[PDB]
Design a protein around this motif. Structure first.
Motif, short mmCIF file in Angstrom:
data_model
loop_
_atom_site.label_atom_id
_atom_site.label_comp_id
_atom_site.label_asym_id
_atom_site.label_seq_id
_atom_site.Cartn_x
_atom_site.Cartn_y
_atom_site.Cartn_z
N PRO D 139 32.16 27.92 -18.97
CA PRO D 139 31.00 28.73 -18.60
C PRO D 139 31.34 30.23 -18.55
O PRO D 139 32.38 30.60 -18.02
CB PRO D 139 30.58 28.25 -17.21
CG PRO D 139 31.23 26.89 -17.06
CD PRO D 139 32.49 27.00 -17.90
N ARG D 140 30.45 31.11 -19.01
CA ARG D 140 30.57 32.56 -18.74
C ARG D 140 30.11 32.92 -17.33
O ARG D 140 30.76 33.69 -16.63
CB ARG D 140 29.80 33.40 -19.77
CG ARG D 140 30.50 33.42 -21.13
CD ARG D 140 29.84 34.46 -22.04
NE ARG D 140 30.51 34.49 -23.35
CZ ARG D 140 30.13 33.91 -24.47
NH1 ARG D 140 29.00 33.27 -24.58
NH2 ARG D 140 30.89 33.97 -25.51
N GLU D 141 29.00 32.33 -16.91
CA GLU D 141 28.48 32.38 -15.55
C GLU D 141 28.04 30.97 -15.15
O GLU D 141 27.52 30.23 -15.98
CB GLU D 141 27.26 33.29 -15.43
CG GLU D 141 27.47 34.71 -15.90
CD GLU D 141 26.29 35.62 -15.52
OE1 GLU D 141 25.13 35.15 -15.52
OE2 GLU D 141 26.52 36.81 -15.26
N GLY D 142 28.21 30.62 -13.89
CA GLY D 142 27.82 29.29 -13.44
C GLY D 142 28.82 28.21 -13.83
O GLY D 142 30.01 28.47 -14.04
N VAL D 143 28.36 26.97 -13.86
CA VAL D 143 29.19 25.77 -13.81
C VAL D 143 28.57 24.67 -14.66
O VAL D 143 27.36 24.64 -14.82
CB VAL D 143 29.36 25.38 -12.33
CG1 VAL D 143 28.08 24.84 -11.68
CG2 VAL D 143 30.46 24.35 -12.14
N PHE D 144 29.37 23.77 -15.23
CA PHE D 144 28.84 22.62 -15.95
C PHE D 144 28.46 21.50 -14.99
O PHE D 144 29.22 21.19 -14.08
CB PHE D 144 29.83 22.08 -16.98
CG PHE D 144 30.17 23.01 -18.12
CD1 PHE D 144 31.49 23.10 -18.56
CD2 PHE D 144 29.17 23.75 -18.76
CE1 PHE D 144 31.81 23.95 -19.63
CE2 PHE D 144 29.49 24.64 -19.79
CZ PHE D 144 30.82 24.73 -20.23
N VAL D 145 27.34 20.85 -15.25
CA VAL D 145 26.87 19.68 -14.52
C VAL D 145 26.16 18.70 -15.43
O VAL D 145 25.62 19.08 -16.46
CB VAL D 145 25.94 20.04 -13.36
CG1 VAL D 145 26.72 20.65 -12.20
CG2 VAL D 145 24.78 20.96 -13.74
N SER D 146 26.11 17.45 -15.02
CA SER D 146 25.35 16.40 -15.68
C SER D 146 24.47 15.65 -14.68
O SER D 146 24.91 15.29 -13.59
CB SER D 146 26.31 15.47 -16.41
OG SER D 146 25.60 14.46 -17.09
N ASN D 147 23.22 15.39 -15.09
CA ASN D 147 22.33 14.41 -14.46
C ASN D 147 22.79 12.95 -14.69
O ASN D 147 22.20 12.02 -14.13
CB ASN D 147 20.90 14.64 -14.99
CG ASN D 147 20.73 14.39 -16.48
OD1 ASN D 147 21.67 14.07 -17.19
ND2 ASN D 147 19.54 14.55 -17.01
N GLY D 148 23.80 12.73 -15.54
CA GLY D 148 24.32 11.43 -15.97
C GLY D 148 23.97 11.05 -17.42
O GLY D 148 24.62 10.18 -18.00
N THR D 149 23.00 11.73 -18.03
CA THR D 149 22.66 11.42 -19.42
C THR D 149 22.83 12.63 -20.35
O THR D 149 23.05 12.48 -21.55
CB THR D 149 21.24 10.85 -19.58
OG1 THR D 149 21.13 9.63 -18.84
CG2 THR D 149 20.92 10.61 -21.05
N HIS D 150 22.74 13.82 -19.77
CA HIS D 150 22.88 15.07 -20.54
C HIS D 150 23.75 16.09 -19.78
O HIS D 150 23.89 16.01 -18.56
CB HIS D 150 21.51 15.67 -20.84
CG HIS D 150 20.86 15.10 -22.07
ND1 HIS D 150 19.77 14.26 -22.01
CD2 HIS D 150 21.15 15.25 -23.38
CE1 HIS D 150 19.41 13.92 -23.23
NE2 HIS D 150 20.23 14.51 -24.08
N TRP D 151 24.33 17.05 -20.51
CA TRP D 151 25.18 18.08 -19.92
C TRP D 151 24.52 19.46 -19.98
O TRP D 151 24.06 19.89 -21.03
CB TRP D 151 26.55 18.10 -20.58
CG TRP D 151 27.50 17.08 -20.05
CD1 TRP D 151 27.66 15.82 -20.50
CD2 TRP D 151 28.36 17.20 -18.89
NE1 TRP D 151 28.56 15.15 -19.69
CE2 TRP D 151 29.02 15.96 -18.68
CE3 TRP D 151 28.62 18.22 -17.96
CZ2 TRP D 151 29.92 15.75 -17.63
CZ3 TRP D 151 29.52 18.03 -16.89
CH2 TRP D 151 30.17 16.80 -16.73
N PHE D 152 24.51 20.15 -18.85
CA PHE D 152 23.92 21.47 -18.67
C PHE D 152 24.89 22.44 -18.03
O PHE D 152 25.74 22.05 -17.24
CB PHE D 152 22.68 21.37 -17.79
CG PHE D 152 21.66 20.35 -18.21
CD1 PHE D 152 21.65 19.09 -17.60
CD2 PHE D 152 20.67 20.68 -19.16
CE1 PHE D 152 20.62 18.18 -17.89
CE2 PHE D 152 19.65 19.76 -19.46
CZ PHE D 152 19.62 18.52 -18.82
N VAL D 153 24.72 23.73 -18.29
CA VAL D 153 25.37 24.82 -17.57
C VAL D 153 24.37 25.48 -16.64
O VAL D 153 23.22 25.69 -17.01
CB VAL D 153 26.04 25.78 -18.55
CG1 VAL D 153 25.07 26.62 -19.38
CG2 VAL D 153 27.01 26.72 -17.84
N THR D 154 24.74 25.75 -15.39
CA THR D 154 23.81 26.26 -14.37
C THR D 154 24.47 27.22 -13.40
O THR D 154 25.67 27.14 -13.17
CB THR D 154 23.16 25.09 -13.63
OG1 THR D 154 22.06 25.59 -12.92
CG2 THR D 154 24.06 24.38 -12.64
#
Ligand SMILES: *[C@@H]1O[C@H](CO)[C@@H](O[C@@H]2O[C@H](CO)[C@@H](O)[C@H](O)[C@H]2NC(C)=O)[C@H](O)[C@H]1NC(C)=O
Ligand SMILES: *[C@@H]1O[C@H](CO)[C@@H](O[C@@H]2O[C@H](CO)[C@@H](O)[C@H](O)[C@H]2NC(C)=O)[C@H](O)[C@H]1NC(C)=O
Ligand SMILES: *[C@@H]1O[C@H](CO)[C@@H](O[C@@H]2O[C@H](CO)[C@@H](O)[C@H](O)[C@H]2NC(C)=O)[C@H](O)[C@H]1NC(C)=O
Ligand SMILES: CC(=O)N[C@@H]1[C@@H](O)[C@H](O)[C@@H](CO)O[C@H]1O
Ligand SMILES: *[C@@H]1O[C@H](CO)[C@@H](O)[C@H](O)[C@H]1NC(C)=O
Ligand SMILES: *[C@@H]1O[C@H](CO)[C@@H](O)[C@H](O)[C@H]1NC(C)=O
Ligand SMILES: *[C@@H]1O[C@H](CO)[C@@H](O)[C@H](O)[C@H]1NC(C)=O
Ligand SMILES: *[C@@H]1O[C@H](CO)[C@@H](O)[C@H](O)[C@H]1NC(C)=O
Ligand SMILES: *[C@@H]1O[C@H](CO)[C@@H](O)[C@H](O)[C@H]1NC(C)=O
Ligand SMILES: *[C@@H]1O[C@H](CO)[C@@H](O)[C@H](O)[C@H]1NC(C)=O
Ligand SMILES: *[C@@H]1O[C@H](CO)[C@@H](O)[C@H](O)[C@H]1NC(C)=O
Ligand SMILES: *[C@@H]1O[C@H](CO)[C@@H](O)[C@H](O)[C@H]1NC(C)=O
Ligand SMILES: *[C@@H]1O[C@H](CO)[C@@H](O)[C@H](O)[C@H]1NC(C)=O
Lengths: 165, 98, 416, 196
Positions: D139-154
């Motif tokens: 990540p440049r800003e924020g953090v990686f997370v998953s709902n369990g089916t997809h991956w997002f940066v937030t």
């Protein structure tokens, strides 16, 4: 004590006599001063009750509905196995309160436990917030008092004033 | 709150007094009624020892023109205990007692 | 080795654990003044109550201090709503937090480090010592909570509820917070845990070998004890009376005149209490100032990451761990220190198509032939690009600008 | 305000103490006695009173340093908290600092600190990096997370997810060096934009 045959008495650092020889027997006696300590009164407000408990500081529960605290022999407070926030502090983890009525005394709670749901692969993220306002108070000044030293000691008196000079 | 209000203190249950359990009366009479007192340039002195010293016998005596305490008070003399007593003795003019 | 063309950058780095010790409270003394001055005499007491309120004032003054020593020990340690606890599985990314977390085997829940500290630090005259409101077992539970929240949730338990996060991701936020990029953790995470677990070892070696560091706590206990022992010794002094022992004067003199002797001692002793209480009021303000510095460090350093230079030992601050101590607190500050460094060449800006380029983060360097842009606090030379740099002005404006070619990855992606 | 009220209430009442004299009143002694003994009564009242002032003035000197240490703290807050924003954790109420509003009070100051507090929260799975080409993304800003089916940066402090892109992630090294890394697709905006 291993008194030498010439010693009539022994003394502590304060020059207080710790021990003595008897004038009518060849025996050496230790002297311990009498048990004493602060009498502290634990009370709710007189608006709410005239019940009190009393803490005799540093006495073992003997020489005075009694409980030993490490602070002293606590008289008139009911020991409780539950723990609560502090209300009236007593000392060495003991706190007392007026609850359903009589004074109870307990080891104080630090707050709820909350073990953390930690793992090397999971994170909690805020979905929503509260904007919160908090008051914080600080004193900044005293009353600017001044005192006339001369007038305080020798009011209207040249006699005194001549002695103060 | 919690208030510090007074001090608790265990009182003495009984009263004990002890002295060396003997009975010899002290030689005060041999001094205060002596057959002869010395010249002041060569003042005499006796050491009083090994005895019960009743001072009431002296303190009540109207024969003394003055009887004046400095390190103790006269009524206390019978309460007190000593390691040594020295009675110095002489003869001066009544004015120089001051 | 300063010059207008030269920079040194760390090619390596050392994590260091420091130690900082603060006193937080005194021995909570109180005295019954009347028992000190005229203990066991109703007649001395009748003489003393001609001087009025001084006895009551000195009792209020020493009580005012003791009621504050509870408040200091509360404000430094009781900075948390809940007693947080660690998991049974120590999945902390390779960090051995076993030496500073609680030991469950001992009667009081103190750590391995705390037990060193409690063993590096060392009557009837109306004098007393009041117990602290918090026992060392309660302080050891507060440091258990503050530390357990720090490891499992970073600073987030300072702000609200503890938000759990992986420890090597908390440490990535830490590193990012000192301008050193998240990948500088992960490319070295075993080395960072080696340096840290080794430095926590050096702390035990230091604290176990000598008490000499804990002078900041021991000087307090020594000053409290010397002032108490002087208050006791001044009972024996004459002040110009025929004995210092009150009971000698009560046996040897009749009341009409004994009162002129005893007044010497009442006045002499009272001046010897007003002296002690004054020393302790100035002292208690010295310990108050330190308990407020300790509460300020525990708020900002433990419950946060500070940016305040040299406020939490030397280096750039990552995190700190509170440990209790007898009448005090000990902080183990964990700091990133730039290690191995070398100086080469540098420039303020570069020139491209007559326009000038500046780094979005980091600073330009030349190895002696080529030009790169590296993050400032750790050597990581990127190709110079329109992604790593931004534009303002032209070559004729800037002092010391250099000649260089910028790579835009959109050129190959259009050209292909 | 009470500590200063108790201080003068005692300073006044210490006039009424004898300190060894025949009366607490200076005009009673000077009505009653001549200089051969009146001065030897009055020196008692001076030795008492003067020590009663040197006590009070000591308490005020010590106290004033305890108030000055709160006036200096209040001026340090009105500098850093009111005229600014503070990164100093828990220095300006519990929570993250936004701003504070100062208010006057009798012999004091009161601050109304406004803080942002995280209040509702969700658990997510997370990883320190993701793998694309066997090249590793951060990540440049924020953090990686998953709902369990997809991956997002937030962003770290408020859940607001985004599909992971070359605009939101930087790269270093390869996927073997990172610990606990995972595979996921990185969106490159430029492929649709070239092909359109
Ligand atoms: C963390 O390091 C400590 C040493 O500092 C480890 O404790 C030692 O464990 C070995 C067996 O593995 C024992 O022989 C030693 O006697 C222990 N040392 C002491 C001083 O008691 C500890 O096990 C390590 N923990 C983890 C999770 O790696
Ligand atoms: C850096 O390189 C540029 C070329 O990119 C140099 O600019 C030239 O300078 C000469 C005179 O020395 C002129 O005749 C050319 O017309 C210039 N060309 C351009 C494109 O500007 C520049 O002088 C070099 N600077 C240094 C310090 O070496
Ligand atoms: C994780 O989030 C994604 C969306 O970002 C969810 O997938 C969507 O589900 C809705 C509702 O059925 C569909 O209309 C969308 O088209 C889906 N999007 C995609 C990209 O598939 C997904 O279900 C969520 N997973 C969990 C476990 O909640
Ligand atoms: C912009 C600037 O200051 N440039 C100077 C350069 O003129 C000088 O010759 C050199 C000496 O090493 O140091 C640099
Ligand atoms: C006190 O009396 C007892 C009993 O007669 C005797 O044994 C003892 O020696 C006496 N003590 C002294 C000091 O005379
Ligand atoms: C005590 O305080 C309560 C408010 O909490 C009030 O309602 C009640 O009347 C008061 N009682 C007395 C005797 O003042
Ligand atoms: C006083 O308390 C102690 C606590 O250790 C106990 O051992 C002792 O026997 C007690 N004494 C009495 C007379 O109750
Ligand atoms: C408290 O609970 C324990 C059982 O855990 C019991 O043995 C003890 O007597 C109780 N004490 C009181 C004061 O009720
Ligand atoms: C000396 O003798 C007289 C009687 O003449 C007697 O009253 C007095 O008490 C005696 N003095 C002493 C010290 O015994
Ligand atoms: C920079 O440091 C190196 C040592 O690493 C030294 O040899 C060199 O001379 C220094 N450069 C300047 C300009 O001082
Ligand atoms: C940094 O230097 C130390 C030696 O002090 C070495 O052990 C470590 O592996 C080096 N780290 C890197 C990333 O090169
Ligand atoms: C996170 O997961 C744990 C699983 O044990 C659960 O107890 C906890 O309440 C969850 N946190 C939130 C904020 O839902
Ligand atoms: C996380 O911990 C588990 C053990 O509970 C381990 O199997 C897994 O490989 C670890 N993952 C990372 C990324 O460290």
């Amino acid at each position: 004590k291993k008194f030498l045959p010439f010693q009539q008495f022994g003394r502590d650092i304060a020059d207080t006599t710790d021990a003595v020889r008897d004038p009518q027997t060849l025996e050496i006696l230790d002297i311990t001063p009498c048990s004493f300590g602060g009498v502290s009164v634990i009370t709710p407000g007189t608006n709410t009750s005239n019940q009190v408990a009393v803490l005799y500081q540093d006495v073992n529960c003997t020489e005075v509905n009694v409980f030993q605290t490490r602070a002293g022999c606590l008289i008139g407070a009911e020991h409780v196995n539950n723990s609560y926030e502090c209300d009236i502090p007593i000392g060495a983890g003991i706190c007392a309160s007026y609850q359903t009525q009589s004074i109870i005394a307990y080891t104080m709670s630090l707050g709820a436990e909350n073990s953390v749901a930690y793992s090397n692969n999971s994170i909690a993220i805020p979905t929503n917030f509260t904007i919160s306002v908090t008051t914080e108070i600080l004193p900044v000044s005293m009353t600017k008092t001044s005192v006339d030293c001369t007038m305080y000691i020798c009011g209207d008196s040249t006699e005194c004033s001549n002695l103060l000079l | 709150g919690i208030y510090q209000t007074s001090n608790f203190r265990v009182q003495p249950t009984e009263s004990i007094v002890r002295f060396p359990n003997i009975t010899n009366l002290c030689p005060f009479g041999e001094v205060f009624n002596a057959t002869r007192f010395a010249s002041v340039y060569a003042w005499n002195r006796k050491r009083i020892s090994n005895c019960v010293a009743d001072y009431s016998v002296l303190y009540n005596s109207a024969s003394f023109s003055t009887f004046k305490c400095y390190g103790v008070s006269p009524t206390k003399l019978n309460d007190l205990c000593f390691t040594n007593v020295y009675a110095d003795s002489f003869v001066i003019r009544g004015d120089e007692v001051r | 080795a300063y010059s207008n063309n030269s920079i040194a950058i760390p090619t390596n780095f050392t994590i260091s654990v420091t130690t900082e010790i603060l006193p937080v409270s005194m021995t909570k003394t109180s005295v019954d003044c009347t028992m000190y001055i005229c203990g066991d005499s109703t007649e001395c007491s009748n003489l003393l109550l001609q001087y009025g309120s001084f006895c009551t004032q000195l009792n209020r003054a020493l009580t005012g201090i003791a009621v504050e020593q509870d408040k200091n020990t509360q404000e430094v340690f009781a900075q948390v709503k809940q007693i947080y606890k660690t998991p049974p599985i120590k999945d902390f990314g390779g960090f051995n937090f076993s030496q500073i977390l609680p030991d469950p085997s001992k009667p009081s829940k103190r750590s391995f480090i705390e037990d060193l500290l409690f063993n590096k630090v060392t009557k009837f005259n109306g004098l007393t010592v009041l117990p602290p409101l918090l026992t060392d077992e309660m302080i050891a539970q507060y440091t258990s909570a503050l530390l357990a929240g720090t490891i499992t949730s970073g600073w987030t338990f300072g702000a609200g509820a503890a938000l759990q996060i992986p420890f090597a991701m908390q440490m990535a936020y830490r590193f990012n917070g000192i301008g050193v990029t998240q990948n500088v953790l992960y490319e070295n995470q075993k080395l960072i845990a080696n340096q840290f677990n080794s430095a926590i070892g050096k702390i035990q070696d230091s604290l176990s070998s000598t008490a000499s560091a804990l002078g900041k706590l021991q000087d307090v206990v020594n000053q409290n004890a010397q002032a108490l022992n002087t208050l006791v010794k001044q009972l024996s002094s004459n002040f110009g009376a025929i004995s210092s022992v009150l009971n000698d004067i009560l046996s040897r003199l009749d009341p009409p005149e004994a009162e002129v002797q005893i007044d010497r001692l009442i006045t002499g002793r009272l001046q010897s209490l007003q002296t002690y209480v004054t020393q302790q009021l100035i002292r208690a303000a010295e310990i108050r100032a330190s308990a407020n510095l300790a509460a300020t460090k525990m708020s900002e350093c433990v419950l946060g990451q500070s940016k305040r230079v040299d406020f939490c030992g030397k280096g750039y601050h990552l995190m700190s761990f509170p440990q209790s101590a007898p009448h005090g607190v000990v902080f183990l500050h964990v700091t990133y220190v730039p290690a191995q460094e070398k100086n080469f060449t540098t420039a303020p800006a570069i020139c491209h198509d007559g326009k000038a380029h500046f780094p979005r983060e980091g600073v330009f360097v030349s190895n002696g032939t080529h030009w790169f842009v590296t993050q400032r606090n750790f050597y990581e030379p990127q190709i110079i690009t329109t992604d790593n740099t931004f534009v303002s002005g032209n070559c004729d404006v800037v002092i010391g600008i250099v000649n260089n070619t910028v790579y835009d990855p959109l050129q190959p992606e259009l050209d292909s």
